[PDB]
Assembly symmetry: D2
Homo-oligomer: 233 residues x 4
């Protein structure tokens, strides 16, 4: 039912559903089988940053994920998002653990959407999330804590990522991400994250996603479905 576009930070290779056999970042257009991926060295316990960039001129959706040591992974995909997304969307962040697990801590998240004609703009920046974050819609296991973080997946009292968890935070306001009369419709989103695991292998990752506004966590979408898709089609 939901239309999803997403950038996934995919920590766990689900080879039987498309993933490459490494941790990877992915552009996902209406399917968890990414249209495009890049090998990504997730750095356990380090604070990472994702940048997602799209404009309707170049019609190239790009993401880059880096860490402070400067290793960074980048992915791009040429796609006309006007053809994919409804005019109004919500934007958000999504995370999963499955059998294997990890902290899916967002430390900051920012987003800018513009429509420039022949301008409407939405921008939010969160560098600190709060306990009762009234412009965020939390779903599933996502919590904002007093440590100023967005914890997208269940952590246990004593600091531990719980498995089978799925959580999302959508910004409260619909965003008008395209308008057929706009000459430029662009969006940028940036988030920093801390994936930490003690697990044999971390899983399952974090995605920034854009969806129809009424979007919600799909049924059994934990683990490899990254809280975005009802299935692996």
């Amino acid at each position: 039912a939901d239309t999803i576009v997403a950038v996934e930070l995919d920590t766990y290779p689900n080879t039987d559903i498309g993933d490459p056999s490494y941790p990877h970042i992915g552009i996902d257009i209406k399917s968890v089988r990414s249209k495009k991926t890049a090998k990504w060295n997730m750095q356990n316990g380090k604070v990472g940053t994702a940048h997602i960039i799209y404009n309707s001129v170049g019609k190239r959706l790009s993401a880059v994920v880096s860490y402070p040591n400067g290793d960074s992974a980048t992915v791009s995909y040429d796609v006309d998002l006007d053809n994919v997304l409804p005019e109004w969307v919500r934007v958000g962040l999504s995370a999963s653990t499955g059998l294997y697990k990890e902290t899916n801590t967002i430390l900051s998240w920012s987003f800018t959407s513009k429509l420039k004609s022949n301008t409407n703009a939405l921008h939010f920046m969160f560098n600190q999330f709060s306990k009762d974050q009234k412009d965020l819609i939390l779903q599933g296991d996502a919590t904002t804590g007093t440590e100023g973080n967005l914890r997208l997946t269940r952590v246990s009292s004593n600091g531990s990522p719980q498995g089978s968890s799925v959580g999302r935070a959508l910004f409260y306001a619909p965003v008008h991400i395209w308008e057929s009369s706009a000459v430029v419709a662009s969006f940028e989103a940036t988030f920093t994250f801390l994936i930490k695991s003690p697990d044999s292998h971390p899983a399952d990752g974090i995605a920034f996603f854009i969806s129809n506004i009424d979007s919600s966590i799909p049924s059994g979408s934990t683990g490899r479905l990254l809280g975005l898709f009802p299935d692996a089609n």
Copy 2:
């Protein structure tokens, strides 16, 4: 019930409830009887611009309303808004006609809210409103048209401001307008408007306002209550 802070562009002098005997801009803190006003020459049928500026450092809320010929009216009031507003608010625009009437056309509206610590930010800009504006909450008579305008009060098919009308548009997302740990909590809001009247005297004006998030149009708040207050206390 609602806590209101507002800048009013008050086209019609309701002297029996505080107004001065001229059209005026006003800062309103929890009462339609402005704490501070300035004589304002509303220019009939011309596009005007309001700017509202507040920061928690100076703790001075200011507005200036100007037109293109450069006549402008300005008002300031020293007030600690942390003491007035709940932490989370909605922001919006409100308009009224009563016995006398006017177009209450908003052509653009922009808003920036920041919390800077020892940053969270929301910014929206509308330069064009659309028929189905999913990040706006319209109340009462407010409509967004295909002419890209926000028509806060009922206009009649043939271009005429109807009386007894009250309408508001709140931005969809709550805004976090103060946070006791922020060192600067500031907001700016800007809107352009076109008040046009054929009436013996225009009424009643436009306000930018900030309220509790669940705020709605008070009972019988048309005319001089500018769609903000249940009474004239």
Copy 3:
């Protein structure tokens, strides 16, 4: 000597040096023979808008030029600008008339450059230029007038574009347009222009360009060299 990257709004087809046989927008990398162009219907006497967008992730430089009736022309080119431009640049606007002529009036110009690490940012917006614009470097025939415009090419007292004219306005501050440790280095530039001609055919166009900081108008670079190149190589 100068390294140029530019988006040209090329009103006059110089077929013997690469142009297509129509008015065109072009991406120019170190040569006036554009790497990529798109047919552009210049609308005589109408206010146009150019948007130039680049980020080091997608590594796609794009421009779109539109007018209010919504006709718009778009061009994109995949290029790694880190390989082309020195780290510090100036940004600007350039215009030419030759044998044929036109007003090369810039009504507004804005620019945003960011370096985001694993942020530095410059943004300027001019919606009104002034007589003595101390953050602009004017070259050749470019003048800022009291009408708030940037007139890149000589106009005659009585409203007429003079021929053989070349003029540029560079923003005063060097911009740091790439930094090998930045994970995103992006820039956007936007300008509105009014090309007006009574001439048999308008010429020669407007470019937004990025150059080494000490860049100046090349010798005899009027007409088809758009004030950017010493020759047509």
Copy 4:
């Protein structure tokens, strides 16, 4: 000769020239004897943040300096800066040691200037300074290092603040800080700093300042003159 407006972070009480007998932040209008000050607990070796905020509506210039533990000091002064500053200015940061000394390390500096009519804007952000910072004008002892810092006063190879030092960094581009037709002319500037001393008492402080564009370090303006004034008048 120079016209200065400044916010001083004054670490050393020069009581014989106006200072209070504590470390203080100060608003300085054309004189080092601040028009207004507030006791400021400089936290030795900690990273501090200054915010300076002015708009021509409220006509209140404010600064707040805080540290991470949240102690913050605030100062405001009602002043019409149109009456004080020339239309075009440069903006910058200034520091001094005298007999007593301190590191005057700027870790980031940002500035936004707007003119809104009846908009021109300049914004720069430096979160990382570089060795050869081509949009900064360094004066006296100010150096940008490879550690990404702006070191306004001489530090010695082995980490030590040298005395008698004075250094400033002005942004390269003049800023148009007022325009008599603007209805709002506002500016915000933000900088983080690290003042560290081993000295019996730290001195002399950091100022953000705005000056005529050709401004330079006054003769013998080390120590208590904070690199802004030729004398203590």
